[PDB]
Design a protein around this ligand. Structure first.
Ligand code: A1IW4
Ligand code: ZN
Length: 111
């Protein structure tokens, strides 16, 4: 027997294994799921956009300050299990209304 199922379709927190998202939810915001972005202190992040995610904990009220995505406010997204910073939740825009910009290098891909 073999298991017949995708090998790299689920994204989990690299630190604790919490289920976070799926390859099926990758979202090409501005024509690419991948964005290389800088914050006000010059830190460069590599963000992957997903339409849906789970297992996160969103901290604080939304902010538009230095938002990387036009029309969206952001909230910090932690791993709800281990508290690792996994990226940001975006809300208040359109097509879609909400989505997640996740730090790709803090996720592990698997079956
Ligand atoms: O869309 C976004 C998400 C937040 C991000 N970002 C940081 C990301 C990491 C650490 C600090 C900050 C920070 C502080 C003030 C305003 C935005 C900030 C940013 O630039 N844009
Ligand atoms: Zn975690």
């Amino acid at each position: 027997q073999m298991v017949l199922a995708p090998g790299a379709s689920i994204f989990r927190c690299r630190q604790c294994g919490q289920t976070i998202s799926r390859r099926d939810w990758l979202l090409p915001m501005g024509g690419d799921h991948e964005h290389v972005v800088f914050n006000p202190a010059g830190m460069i992040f590599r963000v992957w956009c997903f339409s849906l995610a789970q297992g996160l904990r969103l901290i604080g009220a939304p902010s538009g300050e230095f938002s990387w995505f036009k029309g969206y406010d952001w909230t910090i997204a932690l791993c709800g299990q281990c508290g690792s910073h996994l990226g940001w939740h975006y809300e208040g825009g359109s097509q879609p209304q909400t989505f997640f910009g996740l730090i790709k290098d803090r996720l592990a891909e698997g079956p």
